[PDB]
Ligand SMILES: CCCCCCCCO[C@@H]1O[C@H](CO)[C@@H](O)[C@H](O)[C@H]1O
Ligand SMILES: CCCCCCCCO[C@@H]1O[C@H](CO)[C@@H](O)[C@H](O)[C@H]1O
């Protein structure tokens with residue numbers, strides 16, 4: 001088992017790729033669709049040109065990136081790339097408490113780096129037109145519902161993480177592909193309701209870049225901390241109850 | 245194995261996710277596409293912006309969710325999340341008769357919960373504009389053809405379920421992924437003909453929420469009971485005849 | 489459980505039926521739902537009109553996931569050839585009995601006609617008059633010369649995968665169905681708007697029958713979907729062996 | 735191992751299929767979308783009809799082709815079909831130096847063949863309208879950023895190649911599928927920034943056909959040599975540091 005110093009840097013490089021490519025697709029969708037007829041308020045540009053196919057596109061950007069990361073770095077850090085996962089796994093005694101805060105920091109640092117680097121790669125348009133793919137409720141969606149859809153979202157994620165990754169009886173090698181594809185699915189449905197974050201670090205990244213680029217959104221941050229965690233811890237604890 | 249009480253609650257939580265995310269994509273497609281030019285009668289808003297890609301998006305929302313459920317819960321309840329499967333497996337003596345009615349109830353309860361919760365998450369728009377993703381025949385499609393396409397649909401599903409899940413010679417671990425992706429495929433073709441239900445619990449959920457939200461559609465329910473069961477039992481029995 | 493030929497025949501019918509019901513069935517539904525939308529040039533015939541190339545990947549995936557489903561359920565029984573070019577290619581390497589090539593191809597053709605006809609019944613005449621029963625034929629500005637070459641280059645990559653992940657002893661077990669299907673899905677996405685990406689005489693036949701039954705005669709183009717696929721498959725099979733041996 | 739003569743001809747036939755089908759999708763997208771409303775400068779026709787779904791479509795054309803090639807030919811040549819990979823693997827002492835130049839030549843020859851054959855298959859339209867799918871920066875993207883996005887791109891690729899192919903502990907059989915799907919993912923995000931080449935041979939092919947068809951673009955070639963290599967070598971070396 002690799003030194004914590006190396007699992008930290010593994011968690012950085014992982015969450016960096018999560019936030020570079022995942023929310024990077026959301027930006028590029030918005031940027032190439034910018035100008036097209038948005039036929040109602042609920043449609044904010046994503047879906048304008050490719051309908052829900054735009055959301056699957058985006059979900060798959062996320063999924064296949066997430067999968068890549070697990071398959072390359074999972075053996076090293078565990079490939080958490082998400083604080084809700086770390087917190088959920090800790091709440092079952094599958095992760096050391098001493099390492100939860102160090103992991104989450106590694107995730108946040110990685111997320112900020114991915115968001116900032118994407119911004120540099122594309123130009124200011126990435127934020128002013130793409131929002132750096134930051135998550136926030138959609139037209140006609142309150143905070144109440146926003147956390148609930150984020151909890152129901154991250155509940156299904158963690159449930160798969162238990163079933164195909166943590167459980168001794170899980171078929172080896174499927175983990176990365178399954179976990180990622182699952183996220184990809186969740187984004188397709190949940191995307192146009194809350195931006196399907198499922199992940200505090202993945203929300204943080206853009207929020208920083210945006211508020212660095214003049215666009216302050218931290219009002220909505222709790223939705224992406226409370227929602228994901230209550231979903232993940234719920235999933236983790238339910239799993240164990242059902243499987244013993 | 246796990247107590248029936250726990251396989252029940254496993255079947256609820258499974259069918260819940262099946263109906264939350266699967267038909268939830270259908271709703272969100274319709275909602276974001278609401279207002280766009282529907283260039284003929286046959287196009288009812290799905291396909292309006294993203295063409296058949298909208299249907300594949302939707303199918304994948306389903307497929308990846310279904311897969312997630314099998315990989316997480318299949319080890320517990322069997323992950324039937326569908327009464328036609330349960331009835332088909334019983335008709336081969338692979339499932340105890342004592343448990344078919346308890347399973348189907350668990351499925352229906354889970355389906356109503358997933359439909360209701362999605363509704364709460366989004367708002368009334370989810371029903372009045374999205375129809376809660378309920379299945380029903382498409383423009384120029386009679387009841388005769390609607391049960392036949394639903395049979396031909398659920399026939400291919402069950403056939404895979406025999407071939408990659410029930411059969412002792414099936415390559416282990418591929419189950420969840422293959423079965424889900426297969427559904428995904430069916431929806432892509434059959435979607436704009438009957439809404440590709442393949443599943444009485446998956447049709448029931450929306451139908452309840454809709455008729456709770458003022459939109460009564462139970463006229464069409466037999467198409468999604470008869471069609472799927474005749475398809476599933478036909479597949480199960482054909483499989484065994486061919487494989488011995 | 490090496491099942492009787494009678495049962496591998498009926499397995500090959502039920503397999504090629506699902507291949508032609510769902511595969512070309514997506515192509516029809518694409519056309520039908522997109523019917524009326526602005527086709528911004530000649531090369532766009534309605535597929536791509538609403539969902540761009542995403543419409544072609546949608547269609548390719550309808551094919552791929554159906555093909556995959558078949559292999560994983562019936563492969564253990566008939567071999568899940570569901571394609572005469574495959575049977576002929578495998579025979580040309582002595583991996584399939586000559587006595588069973590003609591019986592296999594007939595099973596495939598019967599299954600393909602049944603899938604095409606059943607889809608037609610399911611939807612209505614619109615399925616043919618508007619959807620063309622998803623029959624393959626060259627696209628605007630594509631000659632017969634190029635149409636067979638793109639169909640050979642197409643089915644060459646298919647058969648090459650079939651060798652590598654299904655026929656070869658050293659292939660990782662269980663991946664076969666998924667990989668072979670997804671591969672087809674890939675080929676359709678690129679080749680689709682050039683020839684309809686048939687890769688398969690039985691898959692072309694099905695629609696052609698239904699169409700010519702519904703008044704739309706297209707057999708002029710059938711050789712493109714017999715010659716092209718076979719020359720591609722037999723080439724792939726024979727190249728594979730040359731590369732992988734002694 | 736098979737003789738080098740046969741691994742050469744294996745690398746030709748592989749990179750041929752990479753460039754025929756991969757960039758072949760890009761051409762067909764452009765050709766069928768030719769004429770449609772491009773609602774801003776950043777949208778050059780890809781995305782016009784199917785939004786980002788057009789980019790995922792293209793990425794999957796690539797991914798599934800790449801996967802096919804590894805699964806069929808990887809056993810023979812290693813299925814590099816990419817000079818940056820060969821050069822990266824050499825830099826770790828996993829590939830013989832004597833074979834790096836021969837491999838790269840095989841790749842280039844195979845790429846030129848695939849590009850030329852596609853051109854022949856379709857007609858001049860393939861170049862004059864499709865650009866033979868050649869990669870080049872997008873509107874508002876400088877050379878500085880173009881190499882950085884291509885490095886960040888090919889960095890993720892090689893990182894997966896280490897994790898699921900080179901590493902002794904990698905789950906067997908997942909290689910082809912995972913590596914290809916990963917590329918597919920990268921193209922979806924990076925596509926509309928640089929054309930997501932990740933690969934000198936894959937850029938070369940089109941560039942030749944194009945400059946044969948009157949369209950000279952070699953001004954941009956360094957972006958697709960420097961970018962990919964620096965990304966691949968960085969990834970390879972980082973991996974080993976993290977995994978020992
Ligand atoms: C205990 C409830 C905490 C809320 C978790 C958020 C995800 C909601 O998920 C729900 O969890 C419930 C558990 O009570 C189950 O009864 C429901 O079927 C399930 O859909
Ligand atoms: C008929 C009088 C009873 C109230 C309606 C059903 C119970 C409340 O339920 C709510 O009703 C709203 C409609 O106003 C919906 O938007 C909500 O999503 C639904 O959950």
Ligand SMILES: CCCCCCCCO[C@@H]1O[C@H](CO)[C@@H](O)[C@H](O)[C@H]1O
Pocket residue numbers: 455456
């Ligand atoms: C018999 C079970 C009652 C559960 C309390 C739900 C209260 C929602 O209220 C009512 O429910 C009734 C039954 O669905 C119907 O009259 C209407 O759908 C609804 O207005």
Ligand SMILES: CCCCCCCCO[C@@H]1O[C@H](CO)[C@@H](O)[C@H](O)[C@H]1O
Pocket residue numbers: 735736741808809810811812813828829830
């Ligand atoms: C240092 C001198 C060693 C000479 C052996 C070189 C032959 C390489 O061998 C090839 O390598 C590929 C990837 O590298 C493998 O995947 C292939 O199976 C194999 O054909």
Ligand SMILES: CCCCCCCCO[C@@H]1O[C@H](CO)[C@@H](O)[C@H](O)[C@H]1O
Pocket residue numbers: 808812827828829830899900
């Ligand atoms: C240090 C001596 C140089 C060895 C040359 C490479 C030999 C090929 O080694 C090969 O590596 C591949 C991964 O790329 C795998 O596909 C093969 O299973 C493995 O045998």
